[PDB]
């Protein structure tokens, strides 16, 4: 059920686009567990979700097709954000 | 700095294991703020901390990979305990 444990967490961290034409999916939810479950299952996503950011203030999921290791995005500090990168695509 | 406000508090409450082999991490500390900070950052924890209990008497943190909404644990009254569940995985 709870797949959030499949991710490595970077607190107060979000991912910002380095590439202007990079698409990411978003959705207002209730819990971060919904973000993780949708990510691992790739449900409703047009790409393989490798990581997601949870906006703790808006209660919003940000699904990404790449993690911090790619050239398309990079980490950025943010009080209201938590970054979750699936361990499957890390290191 | 003080991430404890990211949690919903249940006074005089702890979480008891329903799951026989559910692992939790513990540590004697000085304040409950240390527990909250270590939890939101997942530092030193092999899982995603969703909640923590503070033993007010021993000054000890109990970090949990699940909150009361999961079948693996449930609330239990206790004078010396305070339960803190992160709002990110609540409701």
Curated annotation (Swiss-Prot), chains A, B:
Transmembrane segments: none annotated. Residues 2-88 form the PAN domain. Disulfide bonds join 35-61, 39-49. It comes from the Eukaryota. This is Hepatocyte growth factor alpha chain. It comes from Homo sapiens. The lineage of its organism: Eukaryota, Metazoa, Chordata, Craniata, Vertebrata. The gene is HGF.
